[PDB]
């Protein structure tokens, strides 16, 4: 079976900037598209299961743990729960000017541990191939690099595919993230037509991904930079303690305070 987890980056600052701009694309349509993708995923097979996570500057909250319109009961429950919970989360939110960058690393951490919990509870007879369909919508924060890298390595070890679906911006950190675990990376430029992309590129699971034509991966610039400047550097002088990329040879690296002996 397959356990899909959709990490929606619903950053109120950026999405409300769209709302002010009165652009055609809106967070409501984005949520509807993600809802449709989840419904189709569960449509694929009974054993398949999904989950949803919403991201905010403060925290990240799960959006998912008759036939009035003649509808399938389970997908009806999914529709109602996600709609109500997302409206609640967006309507109620404190204001903190100091912190406005969207949070994604913690959401991915919650996702990863959730997949671990499901993998433990599920019967050993059936093998579960989990996936994380990250949907970024705003620029990332510089301060989150270390934690995001740790969670990405945890995902690599645990065999989970981070399928990034960034839109309106190309986060080098997120593209680097998906490259490590081998997840696909699609940058949709036509936001109104986003859902056609998900039902074709992302929706197919790892089992059939290899035997299918999908957009080629984007080149990843694995840049390195000194802590002095944050500028690209091809030669780094790291020590045996900090393991920090530095600019030029120095008597002692500041972040270490070690008694380096010249030679």
């Amino acid at each position: 079976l397959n356990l899909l987890v959709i990490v929606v980056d619903a950053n109120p600052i950026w999405w409300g900037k769209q709302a002010l701009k009165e652009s055609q694309f809106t967070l409501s349509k984005c949520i509807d598209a993600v809802m449709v993708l989840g419904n189709s995923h569960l449509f694929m097979n009974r054993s398949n299961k999904l989950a949803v996570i919403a991201s905010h500057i403060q925290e990240s909250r799960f959006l998912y743990p008759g036939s009035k319109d003649g509808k399938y009961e389970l997908l009806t429950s999914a529709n109602e729960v996600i709609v109500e919970e997302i409206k609640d989360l967006m309507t109620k939110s404190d204001i903190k000017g100091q912190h406005t960058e969207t949070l994604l690393a913690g959401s991915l951490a919650k996702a990863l541990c959730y997949i671990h919990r499901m993998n433990k509870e599920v019967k050993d007879n059936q093998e579960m191939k989990s996936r994380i369909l990250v949907i970024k919508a705003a620029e990332d924060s510089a301060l989150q690099y270390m934690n995001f890298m740790n969670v990405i390595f945890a995902a690599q070890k645990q065999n989970i595919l981070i399928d990034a679906c960034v839109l309106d911006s190309d986060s080098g950190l997120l593209q680097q993230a998906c490259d490590i675990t081998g997840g696909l990376y699609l940058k949709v430029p036509q936001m109104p037509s986003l859902l056609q992309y998900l039902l074709w590129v992302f929706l197919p699971d790892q089992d059939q991904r290899s035997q299918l034509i999908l957009p080629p991966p984007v080149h990843v610039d694995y840049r390195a930079a000194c802590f002095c400047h944050r500028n690209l550097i091809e030669i780094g002088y790291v020590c045996s303690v900090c393991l920090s990329i530095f600019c030029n040879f120095s008597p002692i690296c500041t972040t270490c305070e070690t008694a380096f002996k010249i030679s």
């Binding site: 999405w15 409501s28 449709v36 204001i95 270390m146 940058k187 303690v241 900090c242 500041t254």
Partner: protein, 265 residues
């Protein structure tokens, strides 16, 4: 002693690659071969080390009008009762004698890791927050609002090989081996040339070998382009330019460091 000659004879045919490259450096008469190497049963043996008496007996009784089978026969051949205990003590002692030859870490800046090497009004947040709060009072518009046929067709055309977001030769085989062999030769000589290049080595005897190797770079790169010429004039297809970058970059390092040395002087 001609230890170098013995070693060369040992590796003359045992290892093909080593001798192939060492010979290649002389095939075109690039440089002298001296610098090449300058820079770079059980039972009888056990008895041999076990019993010094057997060693002395072997030296005195070296095969002379006799046979090794007879020598083997001679091996196995209360007074006798104590003899076994004494022999075991002495034998174990001889074996043993043969085996006995004569900081808590502290830091001042941790946020640097939090923002690693990866590189990079107030009322706007209020406006966006309220507008997005009022955005989703209506929900479940999926029936028609989520997608439209025209945009779906445009998306499929984009996913086509000629469309956006979807961009979309092993003819030579025998040339491959020649290229591999040339690359191995470059590797062998570049190894010694770069062995002490990064280190400053501000010593006379240390710098002498670097000067000699730098001249050897001219000598080897003198013959490389001739083989390149032979290969080039075949079809003028599938250009091999990666080799040129190594030579030119080594030359650039050589000349730049020569200029830096002159500047330091």
């Amino acid at each position: 002693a001609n230890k170098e000659l013995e070693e060369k004879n040992r590796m003359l045919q045992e290892d093909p690659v080593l001798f192939q490259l060492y010979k290649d450096l002389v095939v075109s008469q690039v440089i002298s071969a001296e610098e090449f190497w300058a820079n770079r049963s059980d039972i009888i043996e056990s008895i041999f080390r076990t019993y010094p008496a057997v060693k002395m007996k072997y030296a005195e009784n070296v095969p002379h009008n006799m046979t090794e089978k007879e020598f083997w026969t001679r091996f196995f051949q209360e007074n006798s009762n104590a003899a076994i205990i004494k022999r075991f003590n002495h034998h174990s002692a001889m074996v043993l004698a043969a085996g006995l030859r004569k900081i808590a870490l502290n830091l001042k800046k941790s946020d640097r890791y939090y923002h690693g090497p990866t590189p990079i009004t107030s009322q706007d947040i209020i406006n966006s927050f309220q507008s997005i709060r009022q955005e989703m009072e209506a929900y479940t518009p999926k029936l028609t609002q989520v997608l439209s046929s025209s945009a779906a067709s445009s998306t499929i055309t984009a996913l086509s090989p000629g469309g956006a977001l979807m961009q979309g030769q092993m003819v030579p085989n025998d040339i491959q081996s020649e290229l591999k062999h040339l690359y191995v030769a470059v590797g062998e000589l570049l190894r010694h040339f770069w062995s002490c290049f990064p280190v400053n080595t501000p010593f006379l005897e240390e710098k002498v070998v670097k000067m000699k190797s730098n001249l050897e770079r001219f000598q080897v790169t003198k013959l490389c382009p001739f083989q390149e010429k032979i290969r080039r004039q075949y079809l003028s297809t599938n250009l091999v330019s990666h080799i040129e970058e190594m030579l030119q970059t080594a030359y650039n390092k050589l000349h730049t460091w020569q200029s830096r040395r002159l500047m330091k002087k």
